[PDB]
């Protein structure tokens, strides 16, 4: 592809520049190029990949929600709202497919540390979840199952291999709880997971790490905020 001729180190460098310039589509392209070199990503590099694609898909989800709301309200009319919602939807699905493709073809492996394996399986769950937000019919049930299965595998590893305050473990649990509440229509499972996650993190607060405690405490608060919203 388009990044084939560029050195890995140069792609990482340009991803960082694109982040500074708030050029997230470019950032995502650079990081895809870096992934396709076929070497593992470090923690910091996984962050770049994550930030880039989350920004791109986040803009699409926000746009999709606006248009879907106009559409639903207009179904209480020409084809234009539906057409444009479908256009944005198609682009969103394409970005999710790209991410899921990278995860499957390059990033998800049996080897590597717990952090990397959990992070990538969390990411697989997230991008299936984003597909599930716009899916209908047959496709939707399948997508939801794929999301659940990725999250559950990530959860199994995180509980065995990571401290209960680890930010990836916490972020995974937060996102899985959101899946349960918003996607799978299982509020009780959502509440239970979020409560267990928060309580176990507090009980072993001493496991906070010097280099990530700010991220941990932020996710702990987001768990508490959802618990307040859901009860």
């Amino acid at each position: 592809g388009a990044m084939g001729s560029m050195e890995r180190a140069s792609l990482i460098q340009k991803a960082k520049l694109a982040e500074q310039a708030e050029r997230y589509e470019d950032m995502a392209a650079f990081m895809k190029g870096a992934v396709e070199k076929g070497e593992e990503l470090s923690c910091e590099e996984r962050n770049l990949l994550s930030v880039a694609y989350k920004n791109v898909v986040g803009g699409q989800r926000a746009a999709w929600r606006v248009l879907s709301s106009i559409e639903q309200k207009s179904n209480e009319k020409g084809p234009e709202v539906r057409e444009y919602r479908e256009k944005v939807e198609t682009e969103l699905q394409g970005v999710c497919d790209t991410v899921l493709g990278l995860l499957d073809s390059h990033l998800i492996k049996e080897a590597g540390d717990a952090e990397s394996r959990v992070f990538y399986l969390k990411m697989k769950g997230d991008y299936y979840r984003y597909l599930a937000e716009v899916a209908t019919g047959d496709d939707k049930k399948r997508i939801i199952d794929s999301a659940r299965s990725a999250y559950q595998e990530a959860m199994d590893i995180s509980k065995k291999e990571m401290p209960p305050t680890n930010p990836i473990r916490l972020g995974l649990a937060l996102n899985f709880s959101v899946f349960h509440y918003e996607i799978a229509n299982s509020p009780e499972e959502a509440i239970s997971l979020a409560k267990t996650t928060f309580d176990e993190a507090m009980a072993d607060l001493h496991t906070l790490s010097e280099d990530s405690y700010k991220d941990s405490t932020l996710i702990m608060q987001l768990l508490r905020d959802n618990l307040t919203l859901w009860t």
Binding site: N47, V51, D126, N226, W230
Partner: peptide, 10 residues
């Protein structure tokens, strides 16, 4: 109000 997921924070 949607549930909050993991933020895109560096």
């Amino acid at each position: 109000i949607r549930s909050t997921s993991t933020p895109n924070v560096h």
